[PDB]
């Protein structure tokens, strides 16, 4: 891959029923809690966490890379405070794909002062195909997807050096 066009598929503002403005101190930008610029971390709004739904038909004109996370809380407490109801799940599907993942919970060593974890997955969404998310919690959503613009023999070079 030689180029990407970054498309806004599922805009932050389109979830009126959940809290999209949450962040963490592990992503902190100059002391202030932040999060992945390309992701939305959904939490309860008004003590409720209604089913979250989103879909994208691909009008981009080319294939699109899409990524989503699922949050794995440190304890049942965290699960409740964040997503309210337990026994949650995250569902993604397309012409070819199926996943319903459940939030594995384990007490883990603090990493970045964080016992929770986020498991991300990706897929290639074909032209004219459609992606479906629905979840009752622990869903880290894409606000974006990457359309493949230019294609070609290329590579990833591992070096400590700089561009002259």
């Amino acid at each position: 891959v030689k180029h990407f066009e970054k498309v806004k598929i599922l805009p932050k503002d389109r979830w009126t029923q959940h809290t999209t403005t949450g962040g963490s101190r592990a992503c902190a930008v100059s002391g202030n809690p932040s999060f992945f610029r390309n992701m939305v971390w959904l939490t309860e709004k008004g003590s409720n966490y209604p089913v979250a739904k989103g879909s994208y038909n691909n009008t981009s004109g080319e294939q699109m890379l899409i990524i989503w996370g699922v949050h794995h809380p440190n304890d049942e407490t965290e699960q409740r405070t964040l997503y309210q109801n337990v026994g949650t799940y995250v569902s993604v599907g397309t012409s070819t794909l199926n996943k319903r993942s459940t939030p594995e919970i384990a007490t883990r060593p603090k990493v970045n002062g964080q016992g929770g974890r986020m498991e991300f997955s990706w897929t290639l969404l074909d032209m004219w195909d459609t992606i479906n998310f629905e979840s009752t919690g622990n869903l880290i959503a894409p606000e974006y997807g990457f359309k493949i613009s230019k294609r070609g023999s290329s590579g990833i070079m591992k070096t400590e050096g700089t561009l002259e």
Partner: antibody
Amino acid sequence: EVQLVESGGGVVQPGRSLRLSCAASGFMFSSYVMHWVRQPPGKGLEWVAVIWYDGSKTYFADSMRGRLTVSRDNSKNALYLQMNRLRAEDTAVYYCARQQDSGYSGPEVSYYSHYGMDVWGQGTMVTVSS
Amino acid sequence: VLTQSPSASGTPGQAITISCSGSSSNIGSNPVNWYQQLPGAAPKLLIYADEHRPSGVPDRFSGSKSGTSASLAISGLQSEDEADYYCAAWDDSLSGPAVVFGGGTKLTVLG
């Protein structure tokens, strides 16, 4: 070496006003919603106020209506309390405490409500007399 | 305001239990934390969100809540355990949201 140190305490005359600070160290201040709570001298504890990590929202005790300004300077690791029209009741030790969260920071109280106050200062004593 | 037993006492090796009670507003809705203040000094959090203890806290201590009441327990007793004990819970009252503290409890190890 995570700690908070309260200063500004002393004697204040009733009808006048009091100004107090708290110095945070050994941790990231701006990610933590912070607390003011006082213990009258030999009696129990009284919640005073709370200020959000980003300073976006404040909540005051019903006791504190109209007398209270609470502010914070994140870059200075500073907590600021200013209280007007004092009295004998307001005489007490004053405490700056840190509200604990999961990893997570957000606008709703629903998050923090499950937790609370994992670190305190040694306080600063206030006595009200003319 | 919340409410607790006036005072308590027990023996080394003994297990003792202190209670906290309050409105549907606070405890009924929001959960409870427990703080411990040793004499001449400042508070330190004993328990958070009902059952859960923080790090650095011995196992003998542990607690719970049901309905609008909550409870705290020490399974075995050392001289170090002599202090004042406070239940605390968020309210979500009107006027506005607010933290609320129990009056207090003092216990004695009887040394």
